[PDB]
Ligand binder design. Sequence first.
Ligand SMILES: CCCCCCCCCCCCCCCCCC(=O)OC[C@H](COP(=O)([O-])OCC(O)COP(=O)([O-])OC[C@@H](COC(=O)CCCCCCCCCCCCCCCCC)OC(=O)CCCCCCCCCCCCCCCCC)OC(=O)CCCCCCCCCCCCCCCCC
Ligand SMILES: CCCCCCCCCCCCCCCCCC(=O)OCC(COC(=O)CCCCCCCCCCCCCCCCC)OC(=O)CCCCCCCCCCCCCCCCC
Ligand code: HEA
Ligand code: HEA
Ligand SMILES: CCCCC/C=C\C/C=C\C/C=C\C/C=C\CCCC(=O)O[C@H](COC(=O)CCCCCCCCCCCCCCCCC)COP(=O)(O)OCCN
Ligand SMILES: CCCCCC/C=C\CCCCCCCCCC(=O)O[C@H](COC(=O)CCCCCCCCCCCCCCC)COP(=O)(O)OC[C@@H](O)CO
Ligand SMILES: CCCCCC/C=C\CCCCCCCCCC(=O)O[C@H](COC(=O)CCCCCCCCCCCCCCC)COP(=O)(O)OC[C@@H](O)CO
Ligand SMILES: CCCCCC/C=C\CCCCCCCCCC(=O)O[C@H](COC(=O)CCCCCCCCCCCCCCC)COP(=O)(O)OC[C@@H](O)CO
Ligand SMILES: CCCCCCCCCCO[C@H]1O[C@H](CO)[C@@H](O[C@H]2O[C@H](CO)[C@@H](O)[C@H](O)[C@@H]2O)[C@H](O)[C@H]1O
Ligand SMILES: CCCCCCCCCCO[C@H]1O[C@H](CO)[C@@H](O[C@H]2O[C@H](CO)[C@@H](O)[C@H](O)[C@@H]2O)[C@H](O)[C@H]1O
Ligand SMILES: C[C@H](CCC(=O)O)[C@H]1CC[C@H]2[C@@H]3[C@H](O)C[C@@H]4C[C@H](O)CC[C@]4(C)[C@H]3C[C@H](O)[C@]12C
Ligand SMILES: C[C@H](CCC(=O)O)[C@H]1CC[C@H]2[C@@H]3[C@H](O)C[C@@H]4C[C@H](O)CC[C@]4(C)[C@H]3C[C@H](O)[C@]12C
Ligand code: CUA
Ligand SMILES: [Cu+2]
Ligand SMILES: [Mg+2]
Ligand code: NA
Ligand SMILES: [O-]
Ligand SMILES: [Zn+2]
Lengths: 227, 514, 84, 259, 98, 58, 43, 46, 79
Amino acid sequence: MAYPMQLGFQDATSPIMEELLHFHDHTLMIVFLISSLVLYIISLMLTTKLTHTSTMDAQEVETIWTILPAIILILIALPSLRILYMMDEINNPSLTVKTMGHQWYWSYEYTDYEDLSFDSYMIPTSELKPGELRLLEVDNRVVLPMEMTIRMLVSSEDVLHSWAVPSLGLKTDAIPGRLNQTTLMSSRPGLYYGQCSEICGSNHSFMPIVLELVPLKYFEKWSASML
Amino acid sequence: MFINRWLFSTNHKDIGTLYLLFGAWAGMVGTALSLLIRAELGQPGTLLGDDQIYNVVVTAHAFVMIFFMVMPIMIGGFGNWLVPLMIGAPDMAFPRMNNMSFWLLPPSFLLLLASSMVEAGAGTGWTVYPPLAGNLAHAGASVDLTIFSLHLAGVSSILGAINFITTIINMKPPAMSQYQTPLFVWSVMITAVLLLLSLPVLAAGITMLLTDRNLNTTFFDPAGGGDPILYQHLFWFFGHPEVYILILPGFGMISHIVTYYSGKKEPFGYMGMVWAMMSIGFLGFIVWAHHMFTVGMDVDTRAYFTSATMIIAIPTGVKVFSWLATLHGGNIKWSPAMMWALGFIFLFTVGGLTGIVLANSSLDIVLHDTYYVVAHFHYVLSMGAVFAIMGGFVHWFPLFSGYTLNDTWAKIHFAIMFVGVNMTFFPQHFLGLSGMPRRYSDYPDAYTMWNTISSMGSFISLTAVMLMVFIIWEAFASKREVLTVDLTTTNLEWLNGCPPPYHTFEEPTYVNLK
Amino acid sequence: ASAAKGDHGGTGARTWRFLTFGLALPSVALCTLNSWLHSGHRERPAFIPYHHLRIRTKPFSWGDGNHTFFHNPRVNPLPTGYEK
Amino acid sequence: HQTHAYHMVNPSPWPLTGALSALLMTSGLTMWFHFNSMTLLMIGLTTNMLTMYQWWRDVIRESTFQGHHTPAVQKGLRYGMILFIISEVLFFTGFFWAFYHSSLAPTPELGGCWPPTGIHPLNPLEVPLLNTSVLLASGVSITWAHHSLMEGDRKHMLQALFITITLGVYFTLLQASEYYEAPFTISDGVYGSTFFVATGFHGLHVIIGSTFLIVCFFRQLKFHFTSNHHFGFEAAAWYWHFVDVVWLFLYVSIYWWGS
Amino acid sequence: ASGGGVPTDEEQATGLEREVMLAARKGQDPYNILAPKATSGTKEDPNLVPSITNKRIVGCICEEDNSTVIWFWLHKGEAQRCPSCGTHYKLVPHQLAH
Amino acid sequence: FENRVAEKQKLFQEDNGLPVHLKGGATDNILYRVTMTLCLGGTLYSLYCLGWASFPHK
Amino acid sequence: ITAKPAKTPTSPKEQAIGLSVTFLSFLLPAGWVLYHLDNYKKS
Amino acid sequence: HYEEGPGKNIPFSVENKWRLLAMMTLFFGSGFAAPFFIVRHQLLKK
Amino acid sequence: KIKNYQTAPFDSRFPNQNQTRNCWQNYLDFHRCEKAMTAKGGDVSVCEWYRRVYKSLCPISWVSTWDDRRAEGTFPGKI
Ligand SMILES: CCCCCCCCCCCCCCCCCC(=O)OC[C@H](COP(=O)([O-])OCC(O)COP(=O)([O-])OC[C@@H](COC(=O)CCCCCCCCCCCCCCCCC)OC(=O)CCCCCCCCCCCCCCCCC)OC(=O)CCCCCCCCCCCCCCCCC
Ligand SMILES: CCCCCCCCCCCCCCCCCC(=O)OCC(COC(=O)CCCCCCCCCCCCCCCCC)OC(=O)CCCCCCCCCCCCCCCCC
Ligand code: HEA
Ligand code: HEA
Ligand SMILES: CCCCC/C=C\C/C=C\C/C=C\C/C=C\CCCC(=O)O[C@H](COC(=O)CCCCCCCCCCCCCCCCC)COP(=O)(O)OCCN
Ligand SMILES: CCCCCC/C=C\CCCCCCCCCC(=O)O[C@H](COC(=O)CCCCCCCCCCCCCCC)COP(=O)(O)OC[C@@H](O)CO
Ligand SMILES: CCCCCC/C=C\CCCCCCCCCC(=O)O[C@H](COC(=O)CCCCCCCCCCCCCCC)COP(=O)(O)OC[C@@H](O)CO
Ligand SMILES: CCCCCC/C=C\CCCCCCCCCC(=O)O[C@H](COC(=O)CCCCCCCCCCCCCCC)COP(=O)(O)OC[C@@H](O)CO
Ligand SMILES: CCCCCCCCCCO[C@H]1O[C@H](CO)[C@@H](O[C@H]2O[C@H](CO)[C@@H](O)[C@H](O)[C@@H]2O)[C@H](O)[C@H]1O
Ligand SMILES: CCCCCCCCCCO[C@H]1O[C@H](CO)[C@@H](O[C@H]2O[C@H](CO)[C@@H](O)[C@H](O)[C@@H]2O)[C@H](O)[C@H]1O
Ligand SMILES: C[C@H](CCC(=O)O)[C@H]1CC[C@H]2[C@@H]3[C@H](O)C[C@@H]4C[C@H](O)CC[C@]4(C)[C@H]3C[C@H](O)[C@]12C
Ligand SMILES: C[C@H](CCC(=O)O)[C@H]1CC[C@H]2[C@@H]3[C@H](O)C[C@@H]4C[C@H](O)CC[C@]4(C)[C@H]3C[C@H](O)[C@]12C
Ligand code: CUA
Ligand SMILES: [Cu+2]
Ligand SMILES: [Mg+2]
Ligand code: NA
Ligand SMILES: [O-]
Ligand SMILES: [Zn+2]
């Protein structure tokens, strides 16, 4: 989750999101190199009574400042596309959990072995236990075994939603009659929070997502208690 | 006379003046919505107590500001005034069809305002994606009225695009090559061509949406074998070219302003600036699905769409560096317009860079539908499109009106406007990384400080808008008439005096073939 | 291809007039021979109430708002099967 | 007094009556779809016809009678009309995209196959082949009308232009027939949707074209067109090839391949 | 397959379209449909600029392929010069339309 | 039929200072007022209609 | 650019007025609505 | 014919600078008010 | 006979993010199998894999609906 006065990305919970942090660092570093440079050359251009209003040859400098940006772009593209093709992969996962968007809640379906399905609604604000976070807590969390490659299949039963967990670097749009797949791999236990990321109507702000990542042992027992 | 002059105009100048009044008005509508967005978000809790209304206000805000403020002022307003004057044409190719381009917009606008009045309004976001936008989650006439509002604006812009092209292609001096027309005209011809190819697919897209909602087609409804994704492809096929349509006339005006206020006879690298605007125009048509990086298209398609989006940086860069090069060794006049132009150059670049961050389908996973995307586009639109509009306006106001603005007041107006937009939009960068979604009427407590600061910024920008009005008033109140204008040798538009006569180039320019 | 003919000599309308009566219309009449001779009310299809056809997400703005605009009772059933 | 060859146009109300009629028609459709009433749509369609009439009336008045259509003004109208056809090409391109989108990747709901489980499609070698031969034939017959007009042959210009309109009208009845006789509807999922929205917009263009030609016919009856100046006829011939050509793609894409 | 009945521009052309068509025969351009051919633009051989008042906006493409046109008003009287390359232009006023 | 273009030419080129949309007699005036009347009628009626649809009915 | 003097000069006091009127025309009607929200939310 | 020059090529009189302020104030005024009154309108239906 | 199921394995036929069709295919392959065995003296035992994979990937509401339609006879798939 986000803390007060946060500037950057949520602390990474998965190796994908680690790679995005480092990649974001790479890219933002270049973005600083260039925004600084333009600012400097503007102030350079505007601070000298020296004039030269006659014509200037165009076809010479225009090489420097077409080629350099293209070499700079490849320096961005390569790492970017590596991380993309990594996000797909032959992953071969232990477990497959479906999520279904509704106006306005998520339902989860663990159907590998038994027909385990539950609704996961936002705790209202008036009903919060002391220390429980406004707009983020759910009645029934998504319990998942840690350090396991899980398959998430996202869909909707009404309109577009979008299943996001920044902490894990997951955003997959929920589309009716479509089964979108994303893989999940929490490197640690914990609670890890997300919110609908497509405008689904009146209550788009208020259908959040909580991952409770415990170990396999405690997952098995939870599954059987939710049937 | 009032009627024959102002309802039946066949005069590019008068029609231009009509467009400027439309945009200025619509602009106030657009602005008030923008404050209603930030008042709701300015503290934790729900202010309107009805989130469906918040979604309507957001949706209206983007339609108004895109189609009824930025597009009319730049293409309708500056375009009709200047294009004919800059190429020594007595009017536009179709002076009467041109009047219909203008008169379609009031009704177009009425229909949008109407959509928010009836039922619970179109709380869809300006993308209008089904099924939310469909006849089940948005039953009633709100969305249908939004669709028609768009149809009318669409036809209007298509008819104007035909006019600008035809005018620019066919009504130059016979001696005059295309490679001899100023950069602003180029910019409008390439914007005209974008409108021509893009707006017809929008019309197709939102018709198929109309018929889903009213004629029991299933273009987009999986029940009959439809696909919500078909719509996003069609929408965004137009959608991306539209963002370029919105900035391209801005590049024209800056090119002109930066050149004029440097006391150059011409912008650095003129053929480069053409090549760049044709390049942007062209790459703008092959990049659209960077808007669809989370819908579950192939990793290969996502790789392509990433790699293709990145190349736009090259041509766009040529322009940034050509402007800085135009400044080089200038006799700089620190006019208000020049500050607007310099403000743009830097603030557009920042906005252009956050766009390059978003280009990565890997990172766009974590950034899509967050305030990073809002931050990116408010930089290139509120500090890009709007800074070019302001610059253009203060620079050419005396050509239109025959009166001068108070430079000191205009300089104050820039300084207030510059602080506001930056305190408003910069922090939203953090909101994005920190994972605050778009289209939220309320936020986890953590997000409070930046929303509080962002919203205060909005109120500053408003004191700038209210002042600009007064400034326009003071110029008309005081009536200081233009005598003299520098650099008419290389700015034909000024050459007929301020303001120019009803009919200019009764007798065309004399230009030698040599 | 070139098609298997000639002219290009004295380009009259005469040539296009010759192509209109000499190929264009005869072709129309052959396709008309073929067409008004294959025609014969396709023994109508059988009604299975599939959920991906006879869609009704909002009543049409005419009739009972359940009949399409060129409704042929003989080949187009309503969502509840064929009429009298 | 002007010493350019461009047309400064008389203050005209028709741009306004055009915009207002555009409001009445959109408001009318809304009133019709949502609050079952045509009154407005009725009003809208009238002010639109009236506007279109008087607007194009003034253009003929301006050109045939006042002679403002110099070689320069003429050029402009060519560009204008090509640019206009181009916007239509992109407009149809939406409906082809939609068809190709759905036909190349049929969903589970359709039986994961094209054409969908339960659609008894039309045969392309029956009337659709007729429709094609009729429009292709009208492409020859108009081309003959055009050559007759430049060789200064009145009788044959008209004769050839009549055949054209007749073939164009023939098409329209055949299509109206096919529509009625078709065992599927616009309501029959994405097949119905892609089929009737596309062919329907194309059919709508065939009527605008037939109308345009009929306008050029009566103009010719009254001797408006010269041997060497007849832009209204040129544009109509251009627009007729557009309509003919859009038909071929519909025939090859929707009727043949997607069957 | 031969017979008349279609008017010619010669017969039926009218107004400004007619007058352009008549001027074009006599090799004239009273409506500036054609780029005028430059003289050497010396003081003795100045570019004759027809006008129908006592001033006309002259545009000068001083050197070929130059993207920027130099514009200035040419007034009746002693031949004025391009401010940029100094080629000469002189207003030969009037008639053009009787 | 008879070519009468050159007659229509001389009516429409007459220097009587009417705009082109009125230059062809009183019929133009009539047709032009019918158009404008219907437009402004329908536009008034449509705003009214819009007034009705902006408030709800049970 | 150079102009002739103001044909109808706007005095410092005339500007205080115009600015005040201008500022108030955006604020009062907005403020009236914004101020009375509680009584719309619960009608 | 139509009048030309400063304060004449516009659909509004700038003859009186206070009538002008009155005009300008209703124009931008009504524009900036509209959304507030729409929002109200939507709150008061329900 | 080649069991120990945890979840559906990766499938080279359905390699992208869209698995709509992987659900679809494995559902038919099942009810196609299941029909072929019962109606020609055999056992449904061999069709088990296809049921596991469709149960894993397919939303309950999708299977629920398709089952209701096979019953109704309005199932658009060739079984
Ligand atoms: C310089 C520029 C110039 C521009 C020029 C522009 C002008 C355009 C015109 C010129 C263009 C030329 C193009 C080349 C020709 C193309 C040929 C073609 O495709 O037609 C095949 C097509 C094949 O026939 P078919 O109907 O499919 O037969 C199979 C059945 O459907 C089977 O169905 P079933 O199995 O369900 O049926 C069961 C059975 C029931 O079982 C029973 O119980 C048996 C019942 C017995 C039925 C009795 C039938 C008797 C009919 C025979 C008549 C023969 C003599 C008639 C003579 C009369 C003369 C007026 O029914 C039957 O018996 C079926 C009988 C079928 C026999 C075929 C019918 C005869 C047609 C032959 C005409 C070919 C002429 C070509 C054109 C030449 C003119 C220049 O031919 C035609 O039917 C007509 C073609 C006419 C030419 C059209 C040209 C223009 C339009 C087409 C252009 C191509 C498409 C464009 C897009 C492509 C993009 C790449
Ligand atoms: C208004 C709120 C200000 C917030 C203050 C931050 C508090 C610090 C806590 C005290 C700090 C505590 C340290 C905690 C470590 C956090 C690590 C992390 O994960 O941190 C992640 C951070 C890393 O970013 C930073 O490292 C912050 C950079 C801030 C830039 C300074 C600009 C200040 C503008 C002034 C205010 C607005 C008015 C003018 C705006 C002018 C526009 C630039 O998040 C980002 O990725 C920011 C993305 C910004 C993208 C925009 C790029 C273009 C901007 C223009 C550059 C011009 C260069 C010349 C420099 C020229 C100087 C102008
Ligand atoms: C005028 C408006 C405008 C302009 C010009 C742009 C320009 C760009 N935009 Fe943006 N954009 C929007 C308006 C605009 N955009 C809007 C409104 C949305 C949201 C749509 C919605 O959801 O509502 C959006 C969304 C958007 C997304 C989707 C994010 C998401 O939904 O998840 C992406 C992804 O690539 C993107 C990228 C870019 C890029 C690469 C450019 C490039 O054109 C920028 C090029 C400019 C520069 C790069 C700076 C100048 C160049 C240099 C200094 C050269 C050197 C630089 C380098 C080598 C890096 N934009
Ligand atoms: C040109 C486009 C444009 C402009 C100018 C603006 C202006 C502003 N916008 Fe908007 N905005 C969008 C385009 C624009 N916006 C789009 C496309 C979206 C996404 C919509 C969606 O989610 O569906 C959006 C969404 C959006 C959101 C997100 C809502 C949400 O997702 O929850 C927010 C939040 O702060 C916001 C804020 C602002 C603010 C504070 C201003 C202003 O205060 C900035 C200051 C600028 C001005 C006030 C303009 C001044 C100029 C004039 C008044 C014209 C003058 C005329 C003449 C002189 C002739 N905008
Ligand atoms: C005979 C050949 C000529 C075809 C045209 C004839 C009549 C209709 C008129 C014009 C059509 C205009 C646009 C296309 C829109 C809709 C599709 C119409 C195609 C059609 O005609 O489809 C019919 C249904 O039409 C229906 O519902 C009719 C619904 C009537 C409402 C009109 C359409 C409403 C949508 C208008 C949107 C306009 C947007 C354009 C904006 C301008 C561009 C920017 C098919 O009949 P069916 O019984 O379902 O199947 C046959 C079964 N035996
Ligand atoms: C749901 C319903 C939605 C409704 C939306 C429709 C909106 C409005 C409909 C009312 C408009 C109809 C009135 C006719 C318009 C006539 C335009 C015309 O004919 O324009 C001509 C030029 O364009 C040319 O040729 C080339 C351009 C010709 C185009 C003709 C007009 C097109 C109108 C419809 C465009 C739809 C866009 C299609 C693509 C999506 C003439 O231009 P003028 O400046 O007049 O003359 C100048 C003089 O030199 C002539 O002597
Ligand atoms: C000038 C041409 C330049 C050459 C570039 C070539 C590009 C495009 C044309 C090729 C179209 C065939 C597509 C072949 C490859 C994809 C096949 C396919 O089937 O694509 C389909 C979509 O294509 C569709 O209709 C797509 C429909 C077309 C949309 C493409 C955008 C272009 C439109 C603008 C053209 C305007 C120019 C005017 C033309 C006269 C469906 O998507 P899939 O991903 O299959 O969904 C199922 C997945 O689960 C499988 O993994
Ligand atoms: C049931 C029906 C309802 C449907 C609504 C639409 C209705 C009707 C549309 C029919 C179109 C008829 C067009 C009439 C045009 C007449 C004007 C004309 O023909 O004008 C000509 C110029 O062309 C010009 O402006 C060019 C004029 C441009 C014409 C283009 C018109 C296209 C219409 C498309 C509009 C709809 C698009 C689709 C929207 C869904 C005149 O110059 P010339 O011919 O050289 O003559 C001069 C000589 O006499 C002297 O030597
Ligand atoms: C961009 C160009 C496109 C512009 C928009 C096109 C306009 C389409 C108009 C369609 O009008 C139809 O609607 C009527 C609906 O009332 C129908 O009659 C119906 O009305 C009767 C009277 O209530 C009913 O009883 C009957 O069902 C009857 O079919 C009738 O077929 C027809 O007039
Ligand atoms: C983002 C746009 C908004 C910008 C912020 C607005 C700044 C202040 C604008 C002033 O407008 C309000 O001020 C009064 C409160 O100070 C209100 O008094 C109301 O309440 C008073 C009691 O406080 C009564 O005296 C009055 O009768 C009256 O109804 C009044 O209605 C309202 O116009
Ligand atoms: C040749 C052409 C125009 C010259 C003219 O005829 O006046 C010029 C205009 C802009 C030029 C391009 C731009 O300067 C940007 C590029 C600069 C690189 O150094 C070469 C390729 C590059 C892509 C240039 C190639 C070529 O010289 C262009 C395309
Ligand atoms: C009216 C005119 C007479 C010759 C002339 O006007 O100079 C003639 C010449 C060509 C004639 C047309 C052509 O012969 C083509 C058609 C022939 C059919 O008899 C139907 C009428 C038809 C559409 C004719 C109408 C009319 O009689 C036309 C137009
Ligand atoms: Cu569900 Cu937003
Ligand atoms: Cu884009
Ligand atoms: Mg999104
Ligand atoms: Na809030
Ligand atoms: O011709
Ligand atoms: Zn010179």
